[PDB]
Design a protein around this ligand. Structure first.
Ligand SMILES: [Mg+2]
Ligand SMILES: [Mn+2]
Length: 254
C-alpha cells in the first residue's frame, strides 16, 4: 500500500510516495527525468515493509514536483541533494539510508558527503562522479527523444506530455554536459573522500550508458565501500532484475 503526497521544501512542493512501517527509513532517488512512479515501482512494492519505511521522491521539476519546471544550474546536483535531505527531515525522519539510481546516485553521494550525520547507509548504481568525452557523446545521443525506443519513451511521454519531456531532456543533456568543461570534468570527485557511511556500489556489466570505470572510480575513493558487478545487468538493473537487486540492497542495509 502506497501513499502519494506533497511537502513544502525550500520553496517548492515536492511530490513523494511512501510505504512501509519499518524503523529503518530509506529514500529512493530517481535518475534523469525520473520519479517514484516511473523509476521505483518494484521497490515501493517489494522492499520489506516490516524492516523499512520507504520513500520515493520526485526532484523539483520532475515527476509531480511541478511547478516549478526543471532547470539545470551548475549546482543542480547539490540543489537536489539538499532538497532530498530536507524532504526526509520535513517528514520527521531522524536518519535515513539512500538508494540512488543514476543522477540519483550522484545526488546520494553528494548528500552523504555534505550531511554525514544524517545518512546511515547507501546503495547506488549507474552513477558517475565526472564527465569524459565518451560520456559527453553518450549524452548527446540521448538528446533527441524521438529516437528513443518506444518502450523507454512511453512512460515519460505519458508522465510529462511530449513537449515537456522533449524540452527537459534537451536541457538535461546541456545540463550534464556542462561539467566536461570544469577541471577534471568534475561533478563530485571531490566529495567521494568525504562519504563516511557504508556504501554498496552496484553495476550492470552490460550498462550501455555508464562505463564500468566510473563504478570502479567511485569504489576506489569511497572508503570502506563495496562494489558488486552483475554480469547481465544493464542501466535499469533494479527494474529488469528487481528481485536480485532488492535482495542485494536489503541484505546490505541490515
Ligand atoms: Mg584530474
Ligand atoms: Mn510522483
Amino acid at each position: 500500500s502506497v501513499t502519494s503526497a506533497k511537502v513544502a521544501v525550500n520553496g517548492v512542493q515536492l511530490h513523494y510516495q511512501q510505504t512501509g512501517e519499518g524503523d529503518h527509513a530509506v529514500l529512493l532517488l530517481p535518475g534523469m527525468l525520473g520519479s517514484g512512479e516511473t523509476d521505483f515501482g518494484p521497490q515501493l512494492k517489494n522492499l520489506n515493509k516490516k524492516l523499512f519505511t520507504v520513500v520515493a521522491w520526485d526532484p523539483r521539476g520532475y515527476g509531480h514536483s511541478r511547478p516549478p519546471d526543471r532547470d539545470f544550474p551548475a549546482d543542480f546536483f547539490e540543489r537536489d541533494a539538499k532538497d532530498a535531505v530536507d524532504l526526509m527531515k520535513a517528514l520527521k525522519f531522524k536518519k535515513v539510508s539512500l538508494l540512488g539510481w543514476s543522477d540519483g546516485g550522484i545526488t546520494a553521494l553528494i548528500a552523504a558527503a555534505k550531511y554525514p550525520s544524517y545518512i546511515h547507509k547507501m546503495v547506488i548504481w549507474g552513477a558517475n562522479a565526472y564527465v569524459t568525452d565518451e560520456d559527453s557523446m553518450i549524452y548527446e545521443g540521448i538528446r533527441d527523444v524521438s529516437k528513443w525506443s518506444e518502450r523507454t519513451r512511453k512512460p515519460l511521454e505519458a508522465l510529462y506530455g511530449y513537449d515537456y519531456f522533449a524540452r527537459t531532456c534537451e536541457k538535461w543533456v546541456d545540463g550534464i554536459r556542462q561539467f566536461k568543461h570544469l577541471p577534471d570534468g568534475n561533478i563530485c570527485r571531490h566529495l567521494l573522500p568525504r562519504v563516511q557511511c557504508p556504501a554498496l556500489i552496484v553495476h550492470g556489466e552490460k550498462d550501455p550508458l555508464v562505463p564500468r570505470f566510473h563504478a570502479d572510480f567511485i569504489h576506489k575513493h569511497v572508503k570502506g565501500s563495496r562494489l558488486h558487478l552483475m554480469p547481465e545487468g544493464k542501466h535499469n538493473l533494479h527494474l529488469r532484475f528487481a528481485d536480485e537487486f532488492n535482495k542485494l540492497a536489503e541484505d546490505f542495509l541490515q
